[PDB]
Scaffold this motif. Structure first.
Motif, PDB file in Angstrom:
ATOM      1  N   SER A   1       0.792  -1.113   0.036  1.00 25.69           N
ATOM      2  CA  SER A   1      -0.158   0.003  -0.046  1.00 25.69           C
ATOM      3  C   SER A   1       1.006   1.300  -0.099  1.00 25.69           C
ATOM      4  N   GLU A   2       2.000   1.084   0.646  1.00 25.31           N
ATOM      5  CA  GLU A   2       2.884   2.401   0.607  1.00 25.31           C
ATOM      6  C   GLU A   2       3.763   2.430  -0.583  1.00 25.31           C
TER       7      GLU A   2
ATOM      8  N   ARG B   1      -2.302  -2.029  -7.691  1.00 23.74           N
ATOM      9  CA  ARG B   1      -3.055  -2.436  -6.917  1.00 23.74           C
ATOM     10  C   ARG B   1      -4.363  -2.991  -6.940  1.00 23.74           C
TER      11      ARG B   1
ATOM     12  N   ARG C   1      -4.567  -1.127   1.137  1.00 23.70           N
ATOM     13  CA  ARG C   1      -4.974   0.338   0.947  1.00 23.70           C
ATOM     14  C   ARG C   1      -6.189   0.115  -0.078  1.00 23.70           C
TER      15      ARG C   1
END
Ligand SMILES: Nc1nc2c(c(=O)[nH]1)N[C@H]1C(S)=C(S)[C@@H](COP(=O)(O)OP(=O)(O)OC[C@H]3O[C@@H](n4cnc5c(=O)[nH]c(N)nc54)[C@H](O)[C@@H]3O)O[C@H]1N2
Ligand SMILES: Nc1nc2c(c(=O)[nH]1)N[C@H]1C(S)=C(S)[C@@H](COP(=O)(O)OP(=O)(O)OC[C@H]3O[C@@H](n4cnc5c(=O)[nH]c(N)nc54)[C@H](O)[C@@H]3O)O[C@H]1N2
Ligand code: SF4
Ligand code: SF4
Ligand code: SF4
Ligand code: SF4
Ligand code: FES
Ligand code: FES
Ligand SMILES: [Mo+6]
Ligand SMILES: [S]
Lengths: 148, 69, 949
Positions: free
Chosen positions: B32-33, B40, B66
């Motif tokens: 997510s980072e 994603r 995320r």
């Protein structure tokens, strides 16, 4: 075959402290001079550089850069031997062989040494690893006789 | 014919597997980072579609990723 | 500021107690061992010296620094005479005058009177010490000389002709005084004994054991030159051009060491570049590339005007700025409206300053409206910035380069500092020759191992890829035994995690006795090395690309930091975990964003508190999502949803892997701008072109590996009229942003305002202090020479369980051998800057360092042509048999484009940062004649694309 001898020499002086001089001595004793073909391996073994080796070789006189004649004649030119008539001896000898001082050949090689410890037996020389003294202008005949 | 994305996911998993404690939280955090929107989305689509050649750890970690707008 | 900088003192600086003395009736206080000469220098009273230089230790050869000292007999030398308390010395009496005159008389009796038509006129330390002492007459009717071509009775045997074999300097021994500074420098400073003194006495001549310098072990680096006073050794650019007048301080555009230079200038013509005696990075030393290679900036092939194509097959068109930028921005907005802002991107250049870097990432975020930026660091030292971040808290170094002076051991994993970072290797050898010890973990015998006067050395010649196994085994050894520091662990790190790590590592599977099979390294040797590392008081690790560029780079870096924390070699001068950054301003670049997941300051992009600050500062809405990385860019553009690209100062083709793929991805791109100097391999697929500026034309800063911020000055004037930040703002304003910068000082101000660390940074500071380490806030105002000095950044170190994952690039029947890509001293990465110089001498063709036994069965011989039949491509290359590498390993170099090396290279990469697997590639080296199928097409393309109209 030279490489083998050289390797032998290097193995014989392994682990020693400052073993460049001995190694060179032995290399010279073997061949008759320090060939530039053998500046490198020495360095490789000792962890030096070709340059250092060549510099050492160049500094010292006893390390031949090129080979000598079949015979060799070192003739003192120092103080004492000068006193008791070395000049005349030198002249006679270099007239005999026809070779001046420092001038070599395939036959012989006349050179200077600047002392031998024979300071009383003033006129002194080293002919082919044999010391001679009291060299008056007669013994030179015998010097040359055993030496063509 | 492996997707570069699947490959990278499995790599990240292979690593974080040997770790102590939460082994999926960190995976999700990293993905997510570091990854972008389309990537994603593709990954989530893979995990939802249950594509093969994929580590169960990523399957576990996907829901924690995320979300994509 | 210091005097060491501008003035050449006599002897080096010594540390010790203060000592008072009276030089010529003037009080001086200086350390103990410090000489009379240096003290007298510090006091302003100058003494005549020719053979004494600070770079080296003093030797009484000239005998011109003689002085009368109370309590001594005669006229002793100051170079060799250490001070003592209450010593009273006289510097200029009649006696000394006479003697010095006599000595110079003797000198000049063997010197030619070619002053007034010699190169070093105005810069000869003999001339000015001959006028100083007061020489007015020479009385020796000399017959034996070295300069005289014609003696009596014939030629002079002593005469040695000039030697212009080297393309950068020349040796005229006719003018040699035998001060031997040349020697002393190549042996003390650099550390490669290429020079010696052949002869005994008058017959003593400097010489490299070879017909010419080139044939020798002399690489270059003009230390020998920087030190020669008497134009014997002289730069050719000073022979041709005149002797310079002014000096301007800059830095090198190479190597990431930050070797600071002072460019000597005669008007606007660059005569030469000489080190400065400043920068902790270089204390007056260099390499060939920085010292001499600055001629790319004056090559005919440099491009000076913008060009636009509108189609890659079509030829170029020399064009002015305005319409070019118009075209550019038009297409950009078109694409931005069509496919979205995420369909754009940039590629920053480390080679560039940090200012331009900041501008570019702004252009990418503020203007385009995305996070899709990147730089060269994805492929050089990205895993580093992940591991050291997960462990310590910083994605940066730990120490300076002055620390090594204090270490007692050096552990080198994946590096070849003699080629990569020469000036560092020098300082390393200086310490090796002074007792320190060495462990080397490469599979490839490096010249650091064969350094002269080396102390002890261990070499773990392993198999590439197996770099974490070895570390794990080291740790296993240390933990199985009890050598680690418990105090350190309890204090600066955590204990709960240390236990787990120990229990993990203590496993017998990670033991040296088992890994010996897959690793290739012996067991006993490893145990020994580990004991030696763990035993030493102050040890230091210096790692590079052997660890990073692999399928496990982050893992390895982490393992390394674990060792460093376990043993206690952190938070002190002489120890640390130093990664050797490469390109200039890689660190600066990464610090000023240049990553798709962060802002300036290594602050993530999803941080609202930071995004707010920056939205406020730039007055624009930013994105919270992280952008793409280069491989992602290319895969996208192949697949679509990526159409634009602004390539600043980087060759994405020759300097990136799977060349086929990158090409196919660069072609499927409706627009790819270029902002280089020359016509690179990237421009073969371009639509636009913008000239850049060299470091000589620029003005700004460079942030090196030791986090130092060196300052870059303007000596020339931009030939294309505008530097790179100027161009960037041109483009941005043309798009519609609306920035107004007149000087990069303003930008540095902006940065200091936005990001922390640089808050105290100002050009005046750099000018005065000389340099700064970027962690410089109100706290640590001077700078932070050492990181983690008092507790770690995150607060507590972290121990992490590393394991060895078998790489996917294993070898088989059709790909039995391995491969490795690396470097050379003379040439830089792709040599766009360097192939356009005279450094094609030492290396004009890339070659393959193959092993003999792995060649005999193939039929290879030195000078033969071979092919690398790999999986991801094929290439032809000239061979070189050498026992340097281990059997089943091969080494190549990518500096030359005529050879396409990264086409062989595979797409496999790290797990975290996606840094590629350069150092591992299963290949098949065989004999062949026909060059290739790829190289032909490449040349065809490049020829049909580099044509102008
Ligand atoms: N003159 C000159 N200077 C330069 C450069 C140049 O090209 N020319 N390059 C610049 C840049 S951008 C760079 S990245 C920097 C740093 O560049 P370096 O860090 O010096 O990286 P390399 O020289 O490629 O190789 C490092 C060593 O590790 C070896 N190795 C290969 N595989 C393995 C493995 O699995 N384990 C281990 N332990 N070792 C392995 C490599 O073969 C090589 O011996 O230098 C910079 N300075
Ligand atoms: N097989 C293999 N591949 C590798 C590597 C390896 O070891 N082996 N190493 C990897 C690593 S370590 C890295 S750093 C990369 C580096 O590889 P590159 O990205 O090729 O970096 P450079 O060689 O500096 O050239 C980049 C371009 O920018 C231009 N330039 C120079 N100065 C300036 C300036 O002041 N302004 C502007 N606008 N432009 C300028 C140069 O002329 C040149 O064309 O290569 C990577 N790829
Ligand atoms: S080296 Fe110096 S002293 Fe000698 S000729 Fe050249 S300028 Fe004159
Ligand atoms: S240029 Fe450097 S390596 Fe070459 S001889 Fe001079 S000091 Fe030695
Ligand atoms: S070459 Fe230059 S530095 Fe070396 S001994 Fe001669 S004058 Fe001195
Ligand atoms: S060592 Fe590196 S920074 Fe220093 S001059 Fe050479 S290339 Fe430039
Ligand atoms: S002087 Fe010739 S023998 Fe000693
Ligand atoms: S002046 Fe000190 S010895 Fe040359
Ligand atoms: Mo690099
Ligand atoms: S790099």
């Amino acid at each position: 075959t030279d490489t083998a001898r050289l390797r032998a020499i290097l193995a014989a002086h392994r682990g020693r402290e400052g073993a460049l001089l001995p190694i060179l001595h032995d290399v010279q004793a073997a061949f008759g001079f320090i060939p530039e073909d053998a500046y490198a391996p020495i360095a490789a073994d000792l962890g030096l550089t070709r340059a250092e080796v060549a510099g050492v070789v160049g500094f010292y006189h006893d390390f031949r850069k090129a080979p000598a004649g079949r015979h060799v004649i070192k003739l003192c030119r120092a103080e004492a031997c000068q006193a008791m008539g070395m000049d005349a001896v030198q002249a006679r000898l270099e007239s005999a062989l026809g070779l001046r001082l420092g001038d070599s050949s395939e036959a012989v090689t006349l050179e200077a040494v600047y002392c031998l410890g024979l300071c009383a037996c003033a006129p002194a020389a080293m002919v082919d690893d044999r010391l001679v003294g009291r060299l008056d202008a007669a013994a030179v005949a015998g010097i040359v006789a055993e030496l063509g | 014919s492996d997707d570069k994305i699947i490959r990278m996911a499995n790599q990240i998993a292979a690593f974080f597997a040997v770790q102590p404690g939460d082994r999926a939280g960190p995976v999700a955090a990293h993905i997510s980072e570091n990854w972008s929107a389309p990537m994603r989305a593709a990954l989530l689509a893979h995990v939802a579609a249950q594509s093969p050649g994929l580590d169960p750890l990523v399957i576990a970690a996907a829901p924690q990723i995320r979300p994509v707008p | 500021p210091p005097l060491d900088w501008t003035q050449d003192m006599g002897t080096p600086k010594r540390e010790g107690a203060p000592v008072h003395l009276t030089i010529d009736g003037v009080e001086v206080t200086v350390p103990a061992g410090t000489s009379v000469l240096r003290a007298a220098a510090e006091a302003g009273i100058s003494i005549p010296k020719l053979c004494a230089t600070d770079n080296v230790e003093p030797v009484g050869s000239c005998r011109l620094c003689m002085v009368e000292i109370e309590g001594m007999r005669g006229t002793p030398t100051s170079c060799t005479t250490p001070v003592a308390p209450g010593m009273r010395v006289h510097t200029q009496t009649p006696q000394l005058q006479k003697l010095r005159r006599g000595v110079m008389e003797l000198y000049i009796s063997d010197h030619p009177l070619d002053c007034l038509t010699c190169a070093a006129n105005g810069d000869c330390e003999l001339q000015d010490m001959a006028g100083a002492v007061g020489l007015r007459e020479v009385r020796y009717q000399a017959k034996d000389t070295h300069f005289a071509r014609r003696d009596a009775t014939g030629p002079n045997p002593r005469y040695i002709p000039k030697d212009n074999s080297n393309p950068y300097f020349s040796y005229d021994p006719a003018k040699c005084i035998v001060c031997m500074r040349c020697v002393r420098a190549c042996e003390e400073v650099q550390g490669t004994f290429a020079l010696t003194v052949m002869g005994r006495g008058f017959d003593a001549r400097i010489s490299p054991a070879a017909p010419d310098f080139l044939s020798s072990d002399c690489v270059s680096c003009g230390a020998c030159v920087q030190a020669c006073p008497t134009a014997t050794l002289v730069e050719k650019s000073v022979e041709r051009i005149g002797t310079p007048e002014r000096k301007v301080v800059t830095t090198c555009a190479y190597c990431g060491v930050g070797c600071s230079f002072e460019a000597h200038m005669l008007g606007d013509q660059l005569v030469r570049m000489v080190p400065w005696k400043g920068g902790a990075a270089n204390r007056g030393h260099s390499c060939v590339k920085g010292r001499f290679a600055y001629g790319y900036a004056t090559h005919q092939d440099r491009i000076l005007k913008p060009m636009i194509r509108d189609k890659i097959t079509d030829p170029w068109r020399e064009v002015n700025w305005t319409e070019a930028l118009d075209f550019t921005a038009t297409r950009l907005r078109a694409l931005r409206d069509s496919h979205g802002a995420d369909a754009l991107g940039v590629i920053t250049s480390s080679r560039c300053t940090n200012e331009e870097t900041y501008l570019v990432q702004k252009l990418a975020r503020a203007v385009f409206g995305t996070n899709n930026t990147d730089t060269c660091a994805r492929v050089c030292h990205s895993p580093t910035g992940y591991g050291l971040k997960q462990t310590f808290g910083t994605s940066a170094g730990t120490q300076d380069f002055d620390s090594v002076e204090e270490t007692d051991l050096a552990l080198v994993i994946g590096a070849n500092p003699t080629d990569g970072h020469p000036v560092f290797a020098s300082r390393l050898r200086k310490r090796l020759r002074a007792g320190a010890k060495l462990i080397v973990v490469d599979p490839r015998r490096i010249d650091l191992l064969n350094t002269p006067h080396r102390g002890e050395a261990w070499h773990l010649q392993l198999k590439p890829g197996t770099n974490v196994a070895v570390m794990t085994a080291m740790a296993h050894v240390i933990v199985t035994e009890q050598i680690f520091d418990k105090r350190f662990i309890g204090d600066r790190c955590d204990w709960d995690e240390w236990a787990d790590y120990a229990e993990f590592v203590a496993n017998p599977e990670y033991a040296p006795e088992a890994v010996e099979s897959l690793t290739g390294v012996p067991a006993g040797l490893l145990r020994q090395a580990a004991r030696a590392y763990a035993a030493a008081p102050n040890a230091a690790i210096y790692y590079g690309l052997g660890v990073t560029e692999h399928s496990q780079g982050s893992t390895t870096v982490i393992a390394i930091a674990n060792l460093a924390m376990m043993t206690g070699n952190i938070g002190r001068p002489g120890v640390g975990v130093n990664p050797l950054r490469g390109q200039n301003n890689v660190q600066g670049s990464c610090d000023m964003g240049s990553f798709p997941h962060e802002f300036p300051g290594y602050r993530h992009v999803s941080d609202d508190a930071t995004r707010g600050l920056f939205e406020r500062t730039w007055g624009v809405t930013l994105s919270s999502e992280p952008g793409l990385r280069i491989p992602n860019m290319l895969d996208a553009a192949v697949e679509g949803r990526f159409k634009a690209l602004y390539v600043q100062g980087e060759d994405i083709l020759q300097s990136d892997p799977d060349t086929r793929h990158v090409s196919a991805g660069l072609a499927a791109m409706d627009l790819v701008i270029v902002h280089d100097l020359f016509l690179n391999e990237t421009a073969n697929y371009a639509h636009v072109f913008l000239p850049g500026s060299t470091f000589l034309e620029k003005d700004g800063t460079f942030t090196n590996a030791e986090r130092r911020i060196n300052r870059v000055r303007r000596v020339m004037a931009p030939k294309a009229g505008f530097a790179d930040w100027e161009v960037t703002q041109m483009l941005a304003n043309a798009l519609g942003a609306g920035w107004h910068y007149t000087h990069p000082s303003e930008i540095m101000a902006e940065i200091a305002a936005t990001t922390p660390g640089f808050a105290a940074v100002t050009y005046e500071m750099l000018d005065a202090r000389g340099s700064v380490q970027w962690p410089c806030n109100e706290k640590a105002p001077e700078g932070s020479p050492i990181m983690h000095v008092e507790g770690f950044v995150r607060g507590k170190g972290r121990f992490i369980r590393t394991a060895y994952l078998p790489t996917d690039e294993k070898t088989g029947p059709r790909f039995p051998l391995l491969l490795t890509t690396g470097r050379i001293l003379s040439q830089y990465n792709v040599g766009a800057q360097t192939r356009r110089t005279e450094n094609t001498v030492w290396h004009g063709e890339d070659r393959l360092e193959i092993h003999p036994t792995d060649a005999e069965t193939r039929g290879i011989r030195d000078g033969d042509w071979v092919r690398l039949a790999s999986r991801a491509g094929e290439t032809t290359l000239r061979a070189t048999v050498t026992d340097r590498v281990s059997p089943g390993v091969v080494y190549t170099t990518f500096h030359h484009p005529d050879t396409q090396a990264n086409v062989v290279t595979t797409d496999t990469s790290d797990w975290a940062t996606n840094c590629p697997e350069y150092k591992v590639t299963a290949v098949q080296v065989a004999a062949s004649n026909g060059p290739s199928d790829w190289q032909q097409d490449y040349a065809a393309q490049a020829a049909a694309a580099r044509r102008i109209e």
